[PDB]
From a paper:
Biogenesis of the small ribosomal subunit in eukaryotes starts in the nucleolus with the formation of a 90S precursor and ends in the cytoplasm. Here, we elucidate the enigmatic structural transitions of assembly intermediates from human and yeast cells during the nucleoplasmic maturation phase.
Similarly, we could provide a complete near-atomic model for human RRP12-B (previously ‘state B’), which could now be classified into three subpopulations - referred to as states B1, B2 and B3-based on the different conformations of RRP12 and the early recruitment of RIOK2, respectively. RRP12 is a large ARM-repeat protein and consists of 44 protein helices in the center and two long N-terminal and C-terminal extensions. In this position, it reaches deep into the h28 of the 18S rRNA, thus it might either sense or stabilize the immature folding of h28 and prevent complete formation of the 40S neck until (human) state RRP12-B1 is reached. Interestingly, the very N terminus of BYSL reaches along h28 of the 18S rRNA to bind between the two KH domains of PNO1, the same surface of PNO1 that later interacts with NOB1 in state RRP12-B1, thereby preventing premature incorporation of NOB1.
Numbering used by the authors:
A (entry chain V): 1 to 82
B (entry chain A): 2 to 217
C (entry chain y): 7 to 131, 206 to 222, 230 to 412
D (entry chain C): 59 to 276
E (entry chain R): 2 to 65, 76 to 123
Write the structure that this text describes.
Amino acid sequence: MQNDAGEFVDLYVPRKCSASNRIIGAKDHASIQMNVAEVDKVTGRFNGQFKTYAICGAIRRMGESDDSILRLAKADGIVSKN
Amino acid sequence: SGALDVLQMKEEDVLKFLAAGTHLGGTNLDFQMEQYIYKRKSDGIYIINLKRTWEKLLLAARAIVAIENPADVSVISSRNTGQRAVLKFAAATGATPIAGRFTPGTFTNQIQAAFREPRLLVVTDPRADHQPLTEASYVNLPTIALCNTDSPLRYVDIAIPCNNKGAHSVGLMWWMLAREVLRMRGTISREHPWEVMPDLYFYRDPEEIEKEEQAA
Amino acid sequence: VVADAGAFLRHAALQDIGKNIYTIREVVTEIRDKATRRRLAVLPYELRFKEPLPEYVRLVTEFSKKTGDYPSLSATDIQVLALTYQLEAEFVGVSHLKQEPQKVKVSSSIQHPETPLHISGFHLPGGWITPSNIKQIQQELEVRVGCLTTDFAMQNVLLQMGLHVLAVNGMLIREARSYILRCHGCFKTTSDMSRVFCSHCGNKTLKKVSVTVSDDGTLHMHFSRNPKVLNPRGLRYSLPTPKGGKYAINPHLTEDQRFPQLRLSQKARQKTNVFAPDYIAGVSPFVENDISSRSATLQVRDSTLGAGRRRLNPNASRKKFVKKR
Amino acid sequence: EWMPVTKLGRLVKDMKIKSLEEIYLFSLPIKESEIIDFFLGASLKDEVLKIMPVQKQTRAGQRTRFKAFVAIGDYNGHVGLGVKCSKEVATAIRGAIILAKLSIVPVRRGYWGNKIGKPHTVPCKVTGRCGSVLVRLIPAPRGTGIVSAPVPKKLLMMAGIDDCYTSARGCTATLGNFAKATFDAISKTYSYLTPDLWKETVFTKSPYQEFTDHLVKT
Amino acid sequence: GRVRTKTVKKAARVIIEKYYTRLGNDFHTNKRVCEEIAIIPSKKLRNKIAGYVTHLMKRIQRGPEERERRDNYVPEVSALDQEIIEVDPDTKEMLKLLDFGSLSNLQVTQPT
RNA sequence: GACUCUGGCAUGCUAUUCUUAGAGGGACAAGUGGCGUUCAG
Ligand SMILES: [Zn+2]
């Protein structure tokens, strides 16, 4: 990745799944980068700012993407408690 | 809903849910849908918790808002019960509809008439619309689905828990999703009720259409 | 004497009894039976076609949506109801008939809904089927204008409003008992006995409940207080992943879901007829079975076939060398 | 003359997408070979691993076709592996070249010991499996070269790997399984998680979302 | 010379038979409304559309929907706005735990 | 060449009437009169 000289000798940094901290590979075509809108707290309309979650294809296949996105949205204060 | 008093659940929406019957699940339950269920009654039908329905509906609305080109959201229904509703959703929001049979290879076969790239996919029934879910696994598409108690959650990213079997319920769910996405975009005030009455979204059923053309 | 299509199907030649024989063109032009249409071109033509003024068509609709029979009836049935209502209005005074129909009263019992009461051949403890009874057994049998309605929803709304309804028998009907289906999720009733999914909620949850209407205008409805009926035994079972293609049989979970076409060959769905006058010259006593088609290899079955197999609950033990298609 | 169909191809045809790695960053399918021709171009060498003539059973009898196993690869970067069966040898070869170009994956290159200079070897010992053929790549010191059988020798040299110890198990004599196994191992080079890749990922906007306004016009 | 192409003809025919009502005889108003409804990629192409549409509505004013009308139908009162809704006891407990215990339209129906 | 792109004029936006270089406009047979199967031309 980075040599002793200090240069970043690497083609790219792959992105990692937000649910499992797994590397999303270059040929993972069931992988997702999802954007969820953040809204105003006084009017409830689209700010233009959003939150981004990556889900690898194995988790989506296993059927746990829905629970993972819900749990991350609870963590980030998008989904209310209960 | 970020525990915000603006986006909380109102009373008249709950009357819509109870009259349409969205709280009435099926008699079977998928184990990945057990989080969304209040309880099983002794009849056997699973009662769906409507606060969970509201929260997942608002997640779907937030995901649909975050796409700059509204035609990138694609909305699909294969069976008649949702078809009219999805068309109205398009006319409300600008999403691209597929009503009727989904030709396989719409998202994978590049040399084709109906080939198209979405950026989000919204599905009436994951059991009935399984083919676009498979396509979406091929082509990196997220998915929002209207999921009942007995629904597989393979390749479903936001699963709205609702009764998707009755015509009034699917019409209402599509109507509420359009209402919230169009409020949250900002073209409707949250204080005034929507001019579009939800009964526009339901299924025509041509015998009922003739029975209504009779009495006019 | 307003003739429903049930009278023409049953070949009820009752034109001699009444003189106000009137009907819709739509009910007579929708009949798909060849023998009835042949009989139509032979009968003396005293019947006259009309169309009601649409105002009473509305009025019939607003009280049918209140009596709980609106999804069951057809448009043509509303036409028949409106025509007999208008003929009642034109011939007889309109103050006789009442609106805002009376509330149902509830009275439950212990009998199972599948108890075969009111089936002709059956007898609990004499009830015989004689050659003298076949013309007699039609239904529960008991002045100027009447009806020839055989569907129960027709008689229900008619006896709710108070119109005197009569049968293939000349005498008018006083009591009408039958069965309906009620949903135990949304409590909406249907008068169509064929239908298995609910009209409102769409769940496979309709259960049989008996009703009886009087000539007075009272509807009373009998439940079954038997815990066998509402028991969720084989209702939760794990389902296979949804399959597509030409040969997939998904477990049929919604009413308007789309199945691939898997039809029987015309040779296979043919049954043997022994009352035919050309039968005895036939080579075999029975029709040959189809073993040469593609649907024989695909093991396509008739839809009615294999019904008691489905009512066995899926979380149970079948024999160890059988396979359920 | 190339007229793109996919949105990714239409962006690559413009100067919107700068490198191939961006397409690898968001794991998007490449469904046109002209994109790979655009980004790599003259760098892409192509090496025919094998042509086997085969007899198709026809209702007329048997008739001959050809099956071409072709490895394409930019040295110091990327490879792909394609197999095509077709009527003549030339059309089978160009079909396998296209189908090998549609499968181009990046390879991660690391260091054996000290991290001085460019990466030369596989970062960690990786493993690729295809139909009982098991192929393992082990980091090797600088100057040791590729020590392997000839078919993975070609595929690893094309990958820009300078040096690697190799180990193969199973029926390695079936060539497609052996090539596909070593192709699997060099894909798992970037599928492997190391402590170098432990910082939390920042999510940059995808090209479909970055250039939505440019795709409005088409 | 100059000739009109096939896709201009098809798009113009579609936008005429769908939306003849809004159109006028002015070039620029027709061009702006055509850009407003029709998803058109090119400016030159959409001016060609506007010119051909202007020609068509010029020539049809000289001289010479059922599915839409049934599809756009909506009644006076919706079925969901109903006076009495019958609910199971367990659904009423669920609504009670969701703070919605002060409802008036509910009618609880015991399983008998 | 009925293929693709594109110029003339901007006292308009951008660091800007005289030089710049990105974007936005403007032109589409649009209008008129004749010949025309009264529509294609
Ligand atoms: Zn029901």
